[PDB]
C-alpha cells in the first residue's frame, strides 16, 4: 500500500444490524495514522494512531 | 587430528574402489552407480573400546581395528551417472594434494 | 539429553532454548545469593527477587508474562510448556503423529 | 533419565497457579489476582499475624 | 507394566527425591574439550 | 460499567479488535490478553465471570517497575556526599572503638601480631598499613599496645584502668588493619554477644517467658548486680507463687550463671561493658551501614547510564543493571573522599568492570575465558581497522602480520565464537520443521549391528561349544565372555590353578586349534577385508 488516503466501508459486521460504517484513513509516509471513522449513530469520529 | 582423503581405506576392496587414483578422487569419466566412492575420506577414532567376543575374534585372526573411521563420500541410493567434473579447494596455509 | 547441546558440522553448535533459560535463571539465583550475603540495600535485592520470579515464570511458560523475552534471534525463546502444547508440541504432533 | 534440581535462593511463584485463567491461587485465597500481583512484584505488603 | 496414570502437585521433598544432585553453576561445557 | 460494558459487547458480537479495546477503556496488552477468554476471541484490526471479576478490579515490566521504584531517588549533593561519607567514617570509627572497647580484642590483636612476629603471616600483611614505611615502627607500635596493655592490667582493682584500656584504643584508632583481621574479632565479637545473649535466653527466657515472671522482677533483680546469684538465686525467696517456680530451673539457669561468669571471664570485664560496647558498635554500624545505603540510592542514575551501551551483546537489560549495582555497592566500601573527589568519576571504574567482567562470564551458552574474550575483542576491533583500511578484508594471514601470533593460535579463536543455533529455529518448506527435527543420533546401535552381534555370541558359542572344557572355559576366562570378566593371565593362572606361563600355552593351544580353516569357518563369516 502507498501512503495516501483511503475510504474503507467494511460492509456489515459492525454493530450486526446491517450498518455500513465509513472509516476514512490518511496514511502518510512518515508521521501519524489519521483515521476518521463513523459509529452506528452517524456521528463522525477521529483517532490519532 | 585432521581428516585425510587417502585411498587406502578400512574394508574397501581393491576393485571396490576401482575409480580412485592416488589422491582418492574419481577419474573424470568413470560411470558411477549406487555405492561407488567418489572421494575416499576417513576420520580417526581413538580407542573405540571394542566389544568382547570381538576382541576375541580380532585376537583369533590377529586383525585389529585401525585408527581411522570410514567417513568416505559416496554416491547415494539409485542415482547413477558420469563424473564430469571435480573441484579441489584447499585452506590457504595447508599442503595441497597430488590431484589438487 | 532432552535439552541437548548437539555439535554441528563446521565448529558451530545447536542447543534448545531451555538451555539458555535455565542459564539465565541460574544467573539470577547466583546474583541474589551474592546479594544476600552482602546485605545490600533492600531495593536492589527486591529487584533481584522480582527478576528471578520473572525468569522462572518465563521458564515454565511464555504467554502469561507480558513479553516473551527473546534472544539474539529476533524470535521468542521457546520455553517449557510450549514443548507440550500447540500443534508443534509433543502431544498434538509427535506423540500421535510420528514417522 | 536423570533429573537435576535447583535450590532457589528465595521463594517464587509458579505461573500456572498464578496467571492461568481461573487463577488456581486466586480463588484459593479469597483474593483478586491483581492483589496477589501487587504482592508478588514487591509493591504492597500483605498482612499476616 | 503400569496402569492408572496419576498426577498431583509436587512437594519440594519429592523434587529432591527425583534429582541426583543440584545444578549450581551457569557454565555448561568446556569450550576446549567439549566435556 | 465501562469494561463490564465492553465484555457485554464481546459476548454480543464475539470478536473485538484494537479499536474497541483501545477505545473502550503495557496494561493495554495485559487487558487484551485477559479479555481473550471470556471466551471472546479478541483480535487486531469458569472464566466468563472469572475474567469478568479480574476485569472488574479497576504494568509489571520490571524495568518500568524499577523506574517507578527509583522515582523517589535523586542526585545527591557533592559535599553532601562528603557528609554521608564522613557519617560512614564515624560509623566505622564507632566499630573500631567498640572493638577497642573490648580489651581482649586487642589481646587477640597482640596474639596475631606475635604470630607474625613468630612469622605466622607477613609483617605488612598483618595490617593494611597504619594511618601514618618500615614495619619495625608499626610493629614496635603494636608492641606498644603490648606494653600499653600490661600497664593497664594494674588498675581493675578501676579508676585508672578504664582510661588505660582506651589509651591503647586511641592509638588503635590511628591504624588501618586488613579486613580479615578486622572481621575476625568482629565476627568473634558477633560470636561474643550471641553466646552471652543466648545465655539470658537460658537465663531470662526460662524465667520471664515461662515462669510467669513479670519483666520488673528480672530487670529489678538482674540489672544492678547482673553477675552473681543475688539477682537470680535470691529471687526464689520472693514471697511469690511463680518465684516458687524458680526452683526447677534453679540449678539450670544457675548454670547459665556458670556460663555468664565464663563470659564475664571471657569478656574479662562485666558483660554490660561488652553489651554497650557492641551495642554501641552496631548502633552506629547500622547507621554507618545506613549511611552507605543512602549514598548508593543516589547513584543508580550513573549505573543506568553506564549500562546503556552494553545492552544488546546478548544480556538482559535488567541483568546488566544488577551487575552494575554490584560494583556500585562494592565501591561504597572503597570510595574515599579523604582525597577530595567526586564519587561519580570513581564509580564508573568499578561499574564498568562490573558489567564487562560479568558480560564475558555469563553471556553465552558456551563460556569462555576473559583472556580469550580478551583475544576475540582484540581481533574483532583490530579486524575493523584492517578491513576498513587495507580494502577488502583481513585474511588470518594478514592478521598474522598485524598481530604476530602464529595464526594457528589465532585461527582457533576464530573457530571459538558464534554461539550455538537455536534448535527451535524454523526451517524452510513452510512446514514448521524446526532445526532439531533433523539432527540425528550417534549413540544408537545400528539395528543390523545388534542383529549381527546376537549371532556372534551365538556363533562363538558354537565353536566354544565344540571346545575342550579347559579351552572352552579358559578362553571365556581369557576374554571378556558371558560375564563381568577379563581376568588377567595371572588371574586365570590362579583360578585354573596351573601357571601364569602354562595358561598362555593352552591359550596359545586354544585358538591354534581354532585357527583351523574348515574347523572354525563360522567366524570366518565375521571377517570382511
Ligand atoms: C533440506 C533442507 C532445505 C530444504 C528447503 C536443508 C536446510 C538446512 C540443512 C541442515 C542444516 O544445514 C544443518 C545440518 C548441517 C549438517 O552439516 C548436515 C545436516 C543438517 C541437519 C542439514 C540437512 C538439510 O540439507 C537441511 C535440513
Ligand atoms: C531457516 C534457514 C533458511 C532461511 C529460510 C536455515 C536453513 C539452515 C540454517 C543454517 C544451517 O544450520 C547451517 C549453518 C549453521 C550455523 O551454525 C548457523 C548458520 C547456518 C547457515 C544456519 C542459519 C539458518 O537457520 C539456516 C540458513
Domain CATH number, residue B30? 2.40.50.150
Give the atom of ligand 1 at the shortest distance from the alpha carbon of F433.
Answer: 27
Closest residue on chain E to F412 (Cα): E32
| Nearest to F62, CA basis, from E34, D49, B55, C66 | C66
Could you say which of F367, F372, F416 has the minimum Cβ distance to residue E27? F367
Q: Are C99 and C62 in contact (CB under 8 A)?
A: no
Residues 6+ apart with CB under 8 A from B38: B25, B26, B32, B73, B74, B75, B83
Does the beta carbon of C96 sit less than 6 angstroms from any atom of ligand 2? no
Any C CB within 8 A of F486 CB: no
Tell me whether residue F521 is annotated as binding. Answer: yes
Q: Which domain holds residue B64?
A: 1-94
Residue B59 and residue F479: Cβ atoms within 8 Å?
Answer: yes
Per residue in D32-43, is it b (16+ CB within 10 Å) or e — as a string?
Answer: bbebbbeebbbe
Closest residue on chain D to C57 (Cα): D15
Residues of D in contact with F33 (CB under 8 A): none
Sign of dihedral through CA atoms C10, C15, C17, C22? negative
Residues of F in contact with A16 (CB under 8 A): 12-13
Q: C31: number of CA atoms within 13 Å, CB side?
A: 31
Q: What is the dihedral of CA F431, F433, F435, F436, to 10 degrees?
A: -170
**Cα–Cα distance between D34 and D17 in angstroms, integer?**
14
Number of A–F residue contacts, CB under 8 Å: 5
**Cα–Cα distance between B73 and B40 in angstroms, integer?**
6
Residues of F in contact with B10 (CB under 8 A): none
Q: What is the resolution of this structure in A?
A: 3.9
Does the beta carbon of C98 sit less than 6 angstroms from any atom of ligand 2? no
Cell, residue B61: 585372526
**Cα–Cα distance between F176 and F129 in angstroms, integer?**
6
CA angle (F467 as vertex; F466, F471 as ends), nearest 5: 165
Give the atom of ligand 1 at the shortest distance from the alpha carbon of F428.
Answer: 5
B100 occurs within a structural domain: no
Does the beta carbon of F420 sit less than 6 angstroms from any atom of ligand 2? no
Q: For F386, phi and psi rounded to 5 degrees?
A: -105, -40
Residue nearest atom 26 of ligand 2, based on CA coordinates: F427
Pocket of ligand 1 (CB under 6 A): C 8-9; F 427-429, 438-439
Rounded CA Rg of chain E: 17
DSSP state of F338: G
Q: What is the dihedral of CA C42, C46, C49, C51, to 10 degrees?
A: -130
Q: Are C53 and C15 in contact (CB under 8 A)?
A: no
Q: What DSSP element (H or E) covers B94?
A: none
**Cα–Cα distance between F245 and F330 in angstroms, integer?**
53
Any D CB within 8 A of F2 CB: no
Any E CB within 8 A of F368 CB: yes
Residues of C in contact with F62 (CB under 8 A): 47, 50-51, 54
| Nearest to C77, CA basis, from C89, C69, C66, C85 | C69
**How many residues are listed for chain A in this entry?**
49
- Terminal CA-to-CA distance of chain E, rounded, Å? 36
Q: What string of DSSP letters covers F186-250?
A: HHHHHHHHHHHHHHHHHHTTTTTTTS---HHHHHTTHHHH-SSTTTTTTGGGSS-SSGGGGSTTT
B24 occurs within a structural domain: yes
Residue nearest atom 27 of ligand 1, based on CA coordinates: F438
DSSP state of B32: B
Could you say which of D33, D35, D41 has the minimum Cβ distance to residue F65? D41
Experimental method: cryo-EM
Residue nearest atom 16 of ligand 1, based on CA coordinates: C9
B99 occurs within a structural domain: no
| Nearest to F420, CA basis, from C50, C3, C76 | C3
Return the SS3 of F24: coil
**Cα–Cα distance between E5 and D45 in angstroms, integer?**
41
Flag whether F touches D (3+ CB pairs, 8 A cutoff): yes
Q: What DSSP element (H or E) covers A37?
A: strand A34-37
Cell, residue F126: 598483618
Cell, residue F331: 565501591
Q: Are F284 and F91 in contact (CB under 8 A)?
A: yes
Any B CB within 8 A of F486 CB: yes
Q: What string of DSSP letters covers F469-508?
A: HHHHHHHHHHTT-SSS----HHHHHHHTTS-HHHHHHHHH
Rounded CA Rg of chain F: 40
Q: How many domains does chain B have?
A: 1
Does the beta carbon of F428 sit less than 6 angstroms from any atom of ligand 2? yes
**Cα–Cα distance between F263 and F260 in angstroms, integer?**
5
Question: Which chains lie within 8 Å of chain D at 3 or more CB pairs, if any?
Answer: C, E, F
Cell, residue F441: 543420533
**Residue with C-alpha cell 581413538?**
B46
Q: Can you state the angle between helices F103-117 and F135-150, rounded to 10 degrees?
A: 140
**Cα–Cα distance between F237 and F254 in angstroms, integer?**
15
Distance C75 CA to ligand 2 centre (A): 14
**Residue with C-alpha cell 533483680?**
F221
- Ligand whose nearest atom lies closest to the CA of C11: 2
Q: Which of 46-85 (F) contact D at CB < 8 A?
A: 46-47, 50-51, 53-54, 57-58, 60, 62, 65
**Cα–Cα distance between F372 and F480 in angstroms, integer?**
46
- Best residue for ligand 2 mutational test, from C6, C7, C12 (most atoms within 8 Å of Cβ): C12
Count the helix, strand and coil residues of chain E and give each as a percent rounded to the nearest 5.
Answer: 20, 5, 75
Q: What string of DSSP letters covers C2-69?
A: -S--PBPTTS-BEE-HHHHHHHHHHHHHHHHHHHHHHT--HHHHHHHHHHHHHHHHHHH-SSSSSS--
| Nearest to F106, CA basis, from F164, F158, F146 | F146
Determine how β-strand C14-15 pairs with β-strand F421-422. parallel
Number of B–F residue contacts, CB under 8 Å: 44
Amino acid at each position: 500500500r502507498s501512503p495516501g488516503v483511503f475510504f474503507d466501508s467494511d460492509k456489515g459486521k459492525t454493530h450486526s444490524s446491517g450498518k455500513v460504517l465509513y472509516n476514512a484513513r490518511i496514511i502518510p509516509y512518515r508521521g501519524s495514522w489519521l483515521d476518521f471513522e463513523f459509529d452506528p449513530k452517524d456521528n463522525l469520529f477521529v483517532r490519532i494512531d | 587430528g585432521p581428516e585425510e582423503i587417502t585411498a587406502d581405506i578400512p574394508n574397501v576392496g581393491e576393485a571396490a574402489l576401482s575409480k580412485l587414483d592416488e589422491s582418492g578422487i574419481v577419474y573424470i569419466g568413470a560411470e558411477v552407480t549406487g555405492g561407488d566412492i567418489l572421494v575416499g575420506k576417513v576420520t580417526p577414532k581413538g580407542e573405540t573400546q571394542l566389544t568382547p567376543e570381538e576382541k576375541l575374534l580380532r585376537a583369533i585372526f590377529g586383525e585389529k581395528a585401525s585408527d581411522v573411521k570410514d567417513s568416505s563420500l559416496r554416491v547415494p541410493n539409485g542415482v547413477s551417472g558420469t563424473v564430469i567434473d571435480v573441484q579441489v579447494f584447499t585452506r590457504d596455509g595447508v599442503e595441497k594434494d597430488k590431484r589438487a | 539429553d532432552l535439552r541437548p547441546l548437539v555439535p554441528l558440522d563446521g565448529g558451530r553448535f545447536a542447543t534448545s532454548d531451555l538451555n539458555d533459560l535455565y542459564r539465565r535463571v541460574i544467573n539470577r539465583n547466583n546474583r541474589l545469593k551474592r546479594l544476600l550475603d552482602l546485605a545490600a540495600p533492600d531495593i536492589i535485592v527486591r529487584n533481584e527477587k522480582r527478576m528471578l520470579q520473572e525468569a522462572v515464570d518465563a521458564l515454565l511458560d511464555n504467554g502469561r508474562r507480558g513479553r516473551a523475552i527473546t534472544g539474539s534471534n529476533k524470535r521468542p525463546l521457546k520455553s517449557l510448556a510450549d514443548m507440550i502444547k500447540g500443534k508443534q508440541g509433543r502431544f498434538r504432533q509427535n506423540l500421535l503423529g510420528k514417522r | 533419565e536423570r533429573m537435576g534440581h535447583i535450590e532457589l535462593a528465595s521463594p517464587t511463584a509458579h505461573i500456572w497457579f498464578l496467571k492461568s485463567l481461573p487463577s488456581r491461587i486466586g480463588l484459593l485465597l479469597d483474593m483478586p489476582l491483581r492483589d496477589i500481583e501487587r504482592v508478588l512484584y514487591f509493591e504492597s505488603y500483605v498482612v499476616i499475624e | 507394566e503400569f496402569d492408572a496414570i496419576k498426577i498431583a502437585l509436587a512437594s519440594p521433598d519429592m523434587i529432591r527425591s527425583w534429582s541426583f544432585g543440584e545444578v549450581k553453576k551457569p557454565e555448561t561445557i568446556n569450550y576446549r574439550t567439549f566435556k | 460499567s465501562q469494561l463490564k460494558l465492553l465484555v457485554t459487547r464481546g459476548k454480543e458480537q464475539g470478536y473485538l479488535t484494537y479499536a474497541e479495546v483501545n477505545d473502550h477503556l503495557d496494561q493495554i496488552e495485559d487487558i487484551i490478553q485477559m479479555i481473550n477468554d471470556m471466551g471472546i476471541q479478541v483480535m487486531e484490526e469458569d472464566a466468563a465471570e472469572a475474567a469478568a471479576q479480574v476485569l472488574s478490579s479497576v504494568t509489571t515490566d520490571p524495568v518500568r517497575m524499577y523506574m517507578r521504584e527509583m522515582g523517589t531517588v535523586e542526585l545527591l549533593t557533592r559535599e553532601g556526599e562528603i557528609d554521608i561519607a564522613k557519617r560512614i567514617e564515624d560509623g566505622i570509627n564507632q566499630v573500631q572503638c567498640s572493638v577497642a572497647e573490648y580489651p581482649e580484642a586487642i589481646t587477640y590483636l597482640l596474639e596475631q601480631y606475635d604470630r607474625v612476629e613468630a612469622e605466622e603471616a607477613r609483617l605488612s600483611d598483618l595490617i593494611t598499613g597504619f594511618v601514618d614505611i618500615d614495619p619495625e615502627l608499626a610493629r614496635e607500635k603494636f608492641a606498644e599496645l603490648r606494653a600499653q596493655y600490661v600497664v593497664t592490667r594494674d588498675t581493675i582493682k578501676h579508676a585508672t584502668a578504664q582510661e588505660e584500656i582506651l589509651k591503647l584504643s586511641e592509638v588503635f584508632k590511628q591504624f588501618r588493619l586488613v579486613p580479615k583481621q578486622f572481621d575476625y574479632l568482629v565476627n568473634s565479637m558477633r560470636v561474643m554477644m550471641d553466646r552471652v545473649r543466648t545465655q539470658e535466653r537460658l537465663i531470662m527466657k526460662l524465667c520471664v517467658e515461662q515462669c510467669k515472671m513479670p519483666k520488673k522482677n528480672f530487670i529489678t533483680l538482674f540489672t544492678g548486680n547482673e553477675t552473681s546469684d543475688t539477682w537470680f538465686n535470691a529471687a526464689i525467696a520472693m514471697n511469690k507463687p511463680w518465684s516458687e517456680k524458680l526452683h526447677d530451673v534453679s540449678e539450670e539457669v544457675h548454670r547459665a550463671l556458670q556460663k555468664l561468669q565464663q563470659i564475664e571471664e571471657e569478656t574479662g570485664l562485666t558483660i554490660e561493658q561488652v553489651k554497650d560496647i557492641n551495642r554501641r558498635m552496631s548502633i552506629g554500624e547500622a547507621k554507618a551501614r545506613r549511611a552507605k545505603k543512602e549514598m548508593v540510592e543516589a547513584n543508580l542514575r550513573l549505573v543506568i547510564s553506564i549500562a546503556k551501551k552494553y545492552t544488546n551483546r546478548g544480556l538482559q537489560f535488567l541483568d546488566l543493571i544488577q551487575e552494575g549495582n554490584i560494583g556500585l555497592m562494592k565501591a561504597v566500601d572503597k570510595f574515599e573522599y579523604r582525597r577530595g573527589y567526586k564519587f561519580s568519576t570513581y564509580a564508573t571504574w568499578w561499574i564498568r568492570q562490573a558489567i564487562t567482567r560479568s558480560i564475558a562470564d555469563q553471556a553465552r551458552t558456551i563460556r569462555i575465558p576473559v583472556h580469550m574474550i580478551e583475544t576475540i575483542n582484540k581481533l574483532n576491533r583490530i579486524s575493523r581497522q584492517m578491513l576498513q583500511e587495507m580494502g577488502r578484508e583481513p585474511t588470518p594471514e594478514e592478521l598474522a602480520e598485524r598481530m604476530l601470533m602464529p595464526e594457528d593460535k589465532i585461527r582457533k579463536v576464530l573457530k571459538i565464537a558464534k554461539e550455538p543455533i537455536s534448535m527451535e529455529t524454523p526451517i524452510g518448506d513452510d512446514e514448521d520443521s524446526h532445526l532439531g527435527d533433523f539432527i540425528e543420533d550417534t549413540t544408537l546401535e545400528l539395528p543390523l549391528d545388534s542383529a549381527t552381534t546376537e549371532s556372534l555370541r551365538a556363533a562363538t558359542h558354537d565353536v566354544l561349544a565344540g571346545l575342550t572344557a579347559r579351552e572352552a572355559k579358559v578362553l571365556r576366562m581369557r576374554f571378556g565372555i558371558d560375564m563381568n570378566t577379563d581376568y588377567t593371565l595371572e588371574e586365570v593362572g590362579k583360578q585354573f590353578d596351573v601357571t601364569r606361563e602354562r595358561i598362555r600355552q593352552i591359550e596359545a593351544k586354544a585358538l591354534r586349534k581354532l585357527r583351523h580353516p574348515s574347523r572354525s569357518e563360522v567366524l570366518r563369516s565375521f571377517l570382511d577385508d
